[PDB]
Amino acid sequence: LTQSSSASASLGSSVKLTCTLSSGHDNYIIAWHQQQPGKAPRYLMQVGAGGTYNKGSGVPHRFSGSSSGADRYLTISNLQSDDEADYYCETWDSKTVFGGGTTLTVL
Amino acid sequence: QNSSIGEICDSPHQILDGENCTLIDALLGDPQCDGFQNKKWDLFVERSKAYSNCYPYDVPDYASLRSLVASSGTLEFKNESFNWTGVTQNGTSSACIRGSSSSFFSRLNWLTHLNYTYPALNVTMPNNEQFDKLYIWGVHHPGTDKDQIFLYAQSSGRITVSTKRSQQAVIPNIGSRPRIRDIPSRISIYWTIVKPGDILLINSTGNLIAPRGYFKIRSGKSSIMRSDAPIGKCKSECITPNGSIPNDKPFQNVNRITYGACPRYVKQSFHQIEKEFSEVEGRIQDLEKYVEDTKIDLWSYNA
Amino acid sequence: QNSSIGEICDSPHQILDGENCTLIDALLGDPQCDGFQNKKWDLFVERSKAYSNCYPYDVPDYASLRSLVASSGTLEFKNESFNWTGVTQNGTSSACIRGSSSSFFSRLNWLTHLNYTYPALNVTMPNNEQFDKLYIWGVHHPGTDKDQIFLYAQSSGRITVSTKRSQQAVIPNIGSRPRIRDIPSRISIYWTIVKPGDILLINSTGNLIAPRGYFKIRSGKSSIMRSDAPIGKCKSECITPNGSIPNDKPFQNVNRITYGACPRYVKQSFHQIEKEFSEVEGRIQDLEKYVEDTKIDLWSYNA
Amino acid sequence: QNSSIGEICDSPHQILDGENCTLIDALLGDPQCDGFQNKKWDLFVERSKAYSNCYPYDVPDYASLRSLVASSGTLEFKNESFNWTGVTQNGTSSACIRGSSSSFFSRLNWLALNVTMPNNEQFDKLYIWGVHHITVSTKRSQQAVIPRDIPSRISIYWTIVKPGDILLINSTGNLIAPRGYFKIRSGKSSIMRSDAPIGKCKSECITPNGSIPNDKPFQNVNRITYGACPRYVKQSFHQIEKEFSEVEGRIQDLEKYVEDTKIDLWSYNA
Amino acid sequence: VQVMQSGAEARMTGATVKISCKASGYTFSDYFLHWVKQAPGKGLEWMGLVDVDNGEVRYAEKFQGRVTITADTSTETAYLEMTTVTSGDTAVYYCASTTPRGGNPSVYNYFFVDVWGKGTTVTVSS
Ligand SMILES: *[C@@H]1O[C@H](CO)[C@@H](O[C@@H]2O[C@H](CO)[C@@H](O[C@@H]3O[C@H](CO[C@H]4O[C@H](CO)[C@@H](O)[C@H](O)[C@@H]4O)[C@@H](O)[C@H](O[C@H]4O[C@H](CO)[C@@H](O)[C@H](O)[C@@H]4O[C@H]4O[C@H](CO)[C@@H](O)[C@H](O)[C@@H]4O[C@H]4O[C@H](CO)[C@@H](O)[C@H](O)[C@@H]4O)[C@@H]3O)[C@H](O)[C@H]2NC(C)=O)[C@H](O)[C@H]1NC(C)=O
Ligand SMILES: *[C@@H]1O[C@H](CO)[C@@H](O[C@@H]2O[C@H](CO)[C@@H](O[C@@H]3O[C@H](CO)[C@@H](O)[C@H](O)[C@@H]3O)[C@H](O)[C@H]2NC(C)=O)[C@H](O)[C@H]1NC(C)=O
Ligand SMILES: *[C@@H]1O[C@H](CO)[C@@H](O[C@@H]2O[C@H](CO)[C@@H](O[C@@H]3O[C@H](CO)[C@@H](O)[C@H](O)[C@@H]3O)[C@H](O)[C@H]2NC(C)=O)[C@H](O)[C@H]1NC(C)=O
Ligand SMILES: *[C@@H]1O[C@H](CO)[C@@H](O[C@@H]2O[C@H](CO)[C@@H](O)[C@H](O)[C@H]2NC(C)=O)[C@H](O)[C@H]1NC(C)=O
Ligand SMILES: *[C@@H]1O[C@H](CO)[C@@H](O[C@@H]2O[C@H](CO)[C@@H](O)[C@H](O)[C@H]2NC(C)=O)[C@H](O)[C@H]1NC(C)=O
Ligand SMILES: *[C@@H]1O[C@H](CO)[C@@H](O[C@@H]2O[C@H](CO)[C@@H](O)[C@H](O)[C@H]2NC(C)=O)[C@H](O)[C@H]1NC(C)=O
Ligand SMILES: *[C@@H]1O[C@H](CO)[C@@H](O[C@@H]2O[C@H](CO)[C@@H](O)[C@H](O)[C@H]2NC(C)=O)[C@H](O)[C@H]1NC(C)=O
Ligand SMILES: *[C@@H]1O[C@H](CO)[C@@H](O[C@@H]2O[C@H](CO)[C@@H](O)[C@H](O)[C@H]2NC(C)=O)[C@H](O)[C@H]1NC(C)=O
Ligand SMILES: *[C@@H]1O[C@H](CO)[C@@H](O[C@@H]2O[C@H](CO)[C@@H](O)[C@H](O)[C@H]2NC(C)=O)[C@H](O)[C@H]1NC(C)=O
Ligand SMILES: *[C@@H]1O[C@H](CO)[C@@H](O[C@@H]2O[C@H](CO)[C@@H](O)[C@H](O)[C@H]2NC(C)=O)[C@H](O)[C@H]1NC(C)=O
Ligand SMILES: *[C@@H]1O[C@H](CO)[C@@H](O[C@@H]2O[C@H](CO)[C@@H](O)[C@H](O)[C@H]2NC(C)=O)[C@H](O)[C@H]1NC(C)=O
Ligand SMILES: *[C@@H]1O[C@H](CO)[C@@H](O[C@@H]2O[C@H](CO)[C@@H](O)[C@H](O)[C@H]2NC(C)=O)[C@H](O)[C@H]1NC(C)=O
Ligand SMILES: *[C@@H]1O[C@H](CO)[C@@H](O[C@@H]2O[C@H](CO)[C@@H](O)[C@H](O)[C@H]2NC(C)=O)[C@H](O)[C@H]1NC(C)=O
Ligand SMILES: *[C@@H]1O[C@H](CO)[C@@H](O[C@@H]2O[C@H](CO)[C@@H](O)[C@H](O)[C@H]2NC(C)=O)[C@H](O)[C@H]1NC(C)=O
Ligand SMILES: *[C@@H]1O[C@H](CO)[C@@H](O[C@@H]2O[C@H](CO)[C@@H](O)[C@H](O)[C@H]2NC(C)=O)[C@H](O)[C@H]1NC(C)=O
Ligand SMILES: *[C@@H]1O[C@H](CO)[C@@H](O)[C@H](O)[C@H]1NC(C)=O
Ligand SMILES: *[C@@H]1O[C@H](CO)[C@@H](O)[C@H](O)[C@H]1NC(C)=O
Ligand SMILES: *[C@@H]1O[C@H](CO)[C@@H](O)[C@H](O)[C@H]1NC(C)=O
Ligand SMILES: *[C@@H]1O[C@H](CO)[C@@H](O)[C@H](O)[C@H]1NC(C)=O
Ligand SMILES: *[C@@H]1O[C@H](CO)[C@@H](O)[C@H](O)[C@H]1NC(C)=O
Ligand SMILES: *[C@@H]1O[C@H](CO)[C@@H](O)[C@H](O)[C@H]1NC(C)=O
Ligand SMILES: *[C@@H]1O[C@H](CO)[C@@H](O)[C@H](O)[C@H]1NC(C)=O
Ligand SMILES: *[C@@H]1O[C@H](CO)[C@@H](O)[C@H](O)[C@H]1NC(C)=O
C-alpha cells in the first residue's frame, strides 16, 4: 500500500525492498513489478501473507520474496552492472493501488 | 390403440415442458430457464434438443438424483440463513450470463476466500419442521492448482457433510478435463436428505459450492419424461413419447414408456423405471432392460 | 383370504424375537441383547421399537450386509488367535455400558495405541476349514484431530483388508458429526468373505477396529422380517407381519412380504427381497419396487 | 424337451471355443490365448477349468465389463499412435512368459502425463487401461483412481468414448496405459459357461448341457439359454447372469428374484 | 503471450486522442486489461480496468467521468479516448493483461496484472 524510499548498494552485494499495508489489512497479497527507465515494465513477483510467494512465467530465480506480518519484502540475491530500475507493488483488486515506486541505484 | 394424436395434451395431468432446459438444469437454477424457479408439475417433459449454458457440471450417480427430483414433482425452495461468516459469498461465473451480467446458479452459492483466508467452516442447520427436506450442494474441481490456490487459499481442499443418520465425504481432484464450452474445470453436484428432527452439519476446509436453502421433498405421483412431441390441448390422460393415447383398447403398440392408467404394451399388433438409454453402464442396465423384456413377453402371451 | 390370525406362531419355523436389537445390533454384540449371542433362527423378526445403545455406528451397503446375514440364519461364531501384539486391545466407551461398567461391542475389538505407539499391523489368517467363513471389521471416525492423536497417536490412518481374490481399502475421515447420544464420532462397519483355501490379510497403519473371530456362513433357508405382532403358538406355515396366515385359499391380501409355503398377494379384495422402505435412494429402489409391482400386477391378472 | 444332446455345435452361430481362456484374459491379450487376437464371435464359451496364466489382476465391476465385452462380440483392436514420450514403455514381469521370454499383456502397455486421443471416427469406441498397485477424463465424465507369487495386483478399468469426444489421460505414475481402442458394436453376441464338447450338429438352440432341439415348445434342461428357443418351466440374445459363485447382496438377490419370478410365471403359463 | 499497443501521434491542446491495445495470446478471451497513466517523473496511477469479455469497465476516483474507456469484444481489442486533452497529459498509458478467468468467480487474485504493454507516448503541443 504505502511506498518506500530509494535504495543503493555496491556491485556484488545484496539489497532489499519493502511495501507495507495499513492497519486495516494484514493478510492482503501484494505484487512486484519492475520498470526500467525508458522502458516498458515487466511483472516479476507476487507475495503472500504466510511467508510464501507465487511466481509468474519467466520470472527470474535471482529475486526472492518475504513477509513478516503487515509488510511485504523483496530481496535481490545479487545485483551487478546496469541492473537497477524502479519497483512497484499492487496491493488490491478493486483499485490497482500502487505505492509510488522505489528507485534503485548503483554506487 | 396403434396410433396416437401426436401431442402431449396438458389435461388433466399438469405438464411442465422444458423448451431448452433439462430438469436438473432447472433444479440447479440455470439463468437460461429462470422461469422454472419454484414451479410445480405432474409430468416433466424434456425435449431432446436441451442443452446446458451455465458452468459445465456433472452429477455423480445422475440417474437417482434425476429420478428423485422428478418424483418430487415440486421445485419449491426456501431460502435459509446459513452462517457463512469468514468467507465471501456470491461467486459469479462468466459462462452463466444472466441479464447481461456475469452470474451463477440461482440456487447455489460459490464461496471463495475472504481477506485471503478460508476458515474451516463448521455450520449447523437443524431441521425443526415436520417434513422431510432436501439439500443440494457441490464441489468445484479446478483445472489447475493455480485456479485452486487462487480460490481457496489452500491446495488441500476437502468436505464432509453429515447428518444424524449418515455422513458423506467428498475429495476434489485437480486436473484439466477435456474442454467443454471453453471451460476445463468441473462441478460435481450431490444431495443430502434431512428427515424431521435431523440435523445437517457442513464441515469443509475449502472448495465448497454451498446451498442457499432447502427444497421441499415430498412423496407424489409425478414422473419424468423425454420426448420431442408438441404440447396439445385435448383431454386424453395417457402420455407417450409419440403423443397421447386414449384407452380405447386394453393394449397398445405406440411405445413402452407411458404415464397414467394406460393400455399395456405387447409385441403383437405412474412413475416407472427408465426404458431407454444413451450409453452402456453395465449390469444394472442389463437387469433393467431384461425386466422390461420379460414383462413385454409375459403380456404378449397373456394377450 | 383377507384376514390375519394376529400372531407370529413359533412352529414349525424357528422364530427369533428381536425385542430390542436389530439384526445388525445382535450381530455386533450390543450389550443390551447379549442373549442373542450364537443363536440360530429360521426367521428374524425385528420390532418397530428397535433402538441402539452402544457407539453410534453406520454401515456402507447396510441393506446388502443385513440381507446376507439374515439369509445366513446362523450367529455361530468362533474366537480366533489374531496376533494383535504391539498394540493394546479392548477399547472401551462410555455409551456401551454392560452391568453399569464401561464396555464396547462384544464381537469387535477396538484397537488403540500402546505407550503412545501404534505399529503398522500386517496379520494373516488362512481359512483351512471346509466351509466358507465371514469376517466383520470396522474403522473409527474421531470427531477431532486431537481425538485421533489421543486414540492412535498417528494422524495418517489408513487400512486395507485383502484376500487371494481381491482387496478392500478405506480411508477414515477425521471430522465432526452431529452429537448423537453424546458422542461426536462415528464407526463404519465392513464385511469380508473368505472361501476355503483363501487367506485374509489385515493391513493397517492405524485406525482399525478388528474382528474377534469369524461367523459361519451357509445357504440358510431363513430370512428377515419387520413386524410388531406378538409371538403365538399355532402351527400354520406362512408368516406375515400382520400375523400368521393359513393356506385355505392360494390368493391373499394381508401383506406382500411373505415367507415359506404361502398363498400369493393379489390387489383384488423363502428369502425374498425387501419390499418396504423408509428412505429414498433412487434407481435401485425404483427397480426393485417396480419388479414387485410387475409381479403383483401379473398375479392379479391371473386371478 | 427333458434331455440334452450333450454337445455344442458351431452352426449357425459362430461359436468361439475358449478352451483355456476367460473372456477378459483374451481381451487383455494373454500370451496363452494369442489365438483369440482380433477375433469375432457369436457365443463365447468359458470352460470350468478356465484360468489366468500370468500376472494377477482384479477388475472392479467385473460383471459389467464382462457383459459389455461379451455383448460387443468383437475383439478388433487398433494400435493407436499414443504419445508416450518421457516414459519407459514395454514393462515386463516374470509371470507373463511368452515364447520362453519375459512378456506382458499384449493389449496393454506397462509404462505428469497429459495426453489426448480424440475419437475422429464415426463409431462409438472403447478403451481399457490399468492401474498398478491417475485420472482419465472424457467430455461426459471423469474417472479417478488412487493406487501367483506376486503380491502386487493390477486393476483394470475401461472408458467408452462417443464419436467426436476427447479421451484424456492425466497421471503421475502407476498407469498401465492402453495401446489402442476396441471397436465396440451392438450385436446379438453373448457369453456362456459350459464344458460341453464341440460337435457338428445344426440345431440352432444352445444350452450349457449341450444343444437343444427346437421342436418341443418348452424345455426343462437349464434356465440359461441363448437364441429364440424354448423356455424353462418347473414341471418335467443377451441377458443377466443366472449362476453365481459368490454372494454379493441386494443386487444379486434382485437378479435371482427376477429369474425366480419369471420361472414361477412361465411354469404357470404352460 | 504478447501485448502490444498502437503507435501514437502528436495532438494539439483541446483535441482528442485514441489508444488501442490487444493481447490475444490467452486462450479464453475472458481476461482483464488495465489502464495506467504515467507522466515522466511520476509514478504509476490507476485509471481503469476493462473486461474484454463483457461490458465491465472500471475507474479510479481521479479518472471517473472525465475519461471514457471502451473495448471491442468482437475483435478483442481495448480502446482509450479522452476529451479536451491538456498539455499536461503528455505521458505513457500502459495496458496490462491479467490472468484469464476461465469461468472462475473473479476473486481478489484474478485482477492482478502479469504482462505489460510495450508502451506508447502521447504528446500534446501548445
Ligand atoms: C492437458 O492437455 C490438454 C489437451 O492438450 C490441454 O487442454 C487444451 O488447452 C488448450 C490451451 O492450453 C486449448 O486450446 C485452446 O482451445 C480453445 C478451444 O478451441 C475449440 O473451440 C473453438 C470454438 O468453437 C474452435 O474454433 C476450435 O476448433 C476448438 O473446437 C480455442 O479457443 C483456442 O484457440 C485460440 O487461441 C489460440 C492462441 O494460441 C489461437 O491461435 C486461436 O486462433 C484461438 O484464438 C482465439 O480465441 C481466443 C480465446 O477465445 C482469443 O483470445 C483469441 O484472440 C482468438 O479469438 C479472437 O479471434 C477470433 C478470430 O478473429 C474471433 O472469432 C474471436 O472473437 C476473438 O476476437 C485454443 O486452441 C485446448 O482446446 C485444450 N484441449 C482440450 C482437449 O481440452 C490442457 O491445458 C493440458 N493441461 C495442462 C495443465 O497443461
Ligand atoms: C460444529 O458445530 C456444532 C454445532 O454448534 C457442534 O456440535 C455441538 O457440540 C457441542 C459440544 O459441547 C454439543 O453440546 C453438548 O451436547 C450434549 C447434548 O446431549 C450435552 O451432553 C452437553 O451439555 C453439550 O451441550 C452439542 O450438542 C453439539 N450440537 C449439535 C450436534 O447440534 C460441533 O462440535 C462443532 N464442531 C467442531 C469441530 O467444533
Ligand atoms: C505380511 O505378512 C504376510 C504373511 O506372513 C507376508 O506374506 C508372505 O510372505 C512370504 C515371504 O515373506 C511368502 O512366502 C513365499 O511364498 C511363495 C509361495 O508361492 C514361495 O515362492 C516362497 O517359498 C515363500 O514361502 C508368503 O507366501 C506370503 N504369504 C502369502 C499368503 O502369500 C507379507 O510379505 C507381509 N508383508 C510385509 C510388507 O512384510
Ligand atoms: C432454445 O435455444 C434455441 C437455440 O439453441 C433458440 O433458438 C433461437 O431463438 C432465437 C430467438 O430467441 C433466434 O434468433 C435464433 O435464430 C434461434 N436459433 C436457432 C439455431 O434456431 C430458442 O429460442 C430457445 N428457446 C427458448 C424457449 O428459449
Ligand atoms: C448474495 O446474494 C444474495 C442473493 O441476492 C443476497 O441475499 C439476498 O438479499 C436480499 C436483499 O436483502 C434479500 O431480499 C434476499 O432474500 C436475499 N436472498 C437470500 C437467498 O438470502 C445476499 O445478501 C448476498 N450476499 C452478499 C455477501 O453480498
Ligand atoms: C472440520 O472442521 C474443523 C474446524 O476446526 C477442522 O479442524 C481444523 O482443521 C485444520 C486443517 O486440518 C487444522 O489446521 C486445525 O487445527 C483444525 N482445528 C482444530 C480445532 O483442531 C477439520 O479439519 C474439518 N474437517 C473436515 C473434513 O473438513
Ligand atoms: C414412437 O416413437 C418411438 C421412438 O422414436 C419409435 O420407436 C423406434 O422405432 C424405430 C423404427 O422402427 C426403431 O428403429 C427404434 O429402435 C425404436 N425405438 C425404441 C426406443 O424402441 C416408434 O416406432 C414410434 N411409434 C409410432 C407408432 O410412431
Ligand atoms: C428393551 O427396551 C425397553 C424399552 O423399550 C427396556 O425397558 C426399560 O428398562 C429400563 C431398565 O433397563 C426401565 O427403567 C424402563 O422403565 C423400561 N422401559 C419400559 C418402557 O418398560 C428394556 O429393559 C430393554 N431390554 C433390554 C434387555 O435391554
Ligand atoms: C480383551 O478382552 C477379551 C474378552 O474378555 C479377552 O479375551 C478373553 O480371554 C480369556 C482368557 O484367556 C478367554 O477365556 C476368553 O475366551 C477371551 N475372550 C475373547 C472374546 O477373546 C482378552 O484377553 C482381553 N485382552 C486384553 C489385552 O486385555
Ligand atoms: C500395510 O502395512 C505395512 C506394514 O506391514 C505399511 O507399511 C508401513 O507404512 C508406514 C506408514 O506409511 C511406514 O512408516 C512404514 O515404514 C511402512 N513399513 C514398511 C515395512 O514399509 C503400509 O503402509 C500398510 N498399508 C496400508 C494401506 O495400510
Ligand atoms: C399389515 O400390516 C401392514 C404394515 O403395518 C399394513 O400396511 C399399512 O396399511 C395402512 C392402511 O392402508 C397404511 O396407512 C400404512 O402405511 C401401511 N403400513 C406400511 C408399513 O406400509 C397392512 O394394512 C396390514 N394388513 C392388514 C390386512 O391389515
Ligand atoms: C489348456 O491347459 C491345459 C492344462 O491346464 C493343457 O493341457 C496340458 O497340455 C500339456 C501340453 O501342452 C500336456 O503335457 C498336459 O498333459 C495337459 N494337461 C491336461 C490336464 O490335459 C492344454 O494343452 C491347454 N490348451 C491349450 C490350447 O493351450
Ligand atoms: C514396445 O514394444 C512394442 C511391441 O513390440 C513396439 O511396437 C511395435 O513396433 C513395431 C515396429 O514399428 C510395429 O511393427 C508393431 O506393430 C508395434 N506394436 C505395437 C503393439 O505397438 C514398440 O516400439 C516398443 N517400444 C519401445 C519404446 O521399445
Ligand atoms: C495431470 O497433469 C498435470 C500437468 O499436466 C499435473 O499437474 C501437476 O501437479 C503437480 C502436483 O500438484 C504440480 O506440482 C505441477 O506443477 C502440475 N503440473 C503442471 C504442468 O501444472 C497433474 O498432477 C496430473 N494429474 C495427476 C492426477 O497426476
Ligand atoms: C444341466 O446342467 C445343469 C448344471 O450342472 C444341471 O442343473 C442342476 O441340476 C441339479 C439336479 O437337478 C440341481 O440340483 C442343480 O441345482 C442344478 N444346477 C443349477 C445351477 O441350477 C441340470 O440338471 C443339467 N441337465 C441335464 C439334462 O443334464
Ligand atoms: C429467496 O431469495 C431469492 C434471491 O436469492 C429471492 O428472489 C426470493 O424472492 C427469495 N424468496 C422469497 C420467498 O422471498
Ligand atoms: C454465526 O457465526 C458467528 C461467528 O462464529 C457467531 O458469532 C454467530 O453467533 C453465529 N450465528 C448463528 C445464528 O449461529
Ligand atoms: C479483513 O479483516 C479486517 C479486520 O482484520 C476487517 O476490517 C476487514 O473488513 C476485512 N476485509 C473485508 C474485505 O471484509
Ligand atoms: C469365546 O470367548 C467367550 C468369552 O469371551 C467364551 O464364552 C466363548 O465360549 C468362546 N467361544 C469359543 C468358540 O471359544
Ligand atoms: C506376532 O506379531 C509379532 C509382532 O509383530 C511378531 O514378532 C510375531 O512373530 C508374530 N507371531 C506370529 C505367530 O505371527
Ligand atoms: C514406554 O515408553 C517409555 C518411554 O517413553 C519407556 O520408559 C517404557 O519402558 C515404555 N514401556 C513399554 C511397556 O513399552
Ligand atoms: C498392432 O501391432 C501388432 C504388433 O505388436 C500387430 O501384430 C498387429 O497386427 C497390429 N494391429 C493392427 C490392427 O494392425
Ligand atoms: C508428443 O509429445 C512430445 C513431447 O511433448 C511433443 O514434442 C510432440 O510434438 C508430441 N507429438 C504429438 C503427435 O502430439
UniProtKB/TrEMBL annotation, chain D:
Query: Which part of the full protein does this chain span, and how long is the full protein?
Result: 60 to 441 of 566
Glycan-modified residues:
N83, N90, N209
Describe the subunit structure: Homotrimer of disulfide-linked HA1-HA2.
- Localization in the cell: Host apical cell membrane; Virion membrane
User: Which residues pair up as cystines?
Assistant: C9-C201, C21-C33, C54-C96, C205-C229
Q: Which family does it belong to?
A: Belongs to the influenza viruses hemagglutinin family.
Question: Could you identify this protein by its name?
Answer: Hemagglutinin
Q: Name its species.
A: Influenza A virus
Free-text description of this protein's post-translational modifications in UniProt: Palmitoylated. In natural infection, inactive HA is matured into HA1 and HA2 outside the cell by one or more trypsin-like, arginine-specific endoprotease secreted by the bronchial epithelial cells. One identified protease that may be involved in this process is secreted in lungs by club cells.
Function field: Binds to sialic acid-containing receptors on the cell surface, bringing about the attachment of the virus particle to the cell. This attachment induces virion internalization either through clathrin-dependent endocytosis or through clathrin- and caveolin-independent pathway. Plays a major role in the determination of host range restriction and virulence. Class I viral fusion protein. Responsible for penetration of the virus into the cell cytoplasm by mediating the fusion of the membrane of the endocytosed virus particle with the endosomal membrane.
Give the domain of life: Viruses
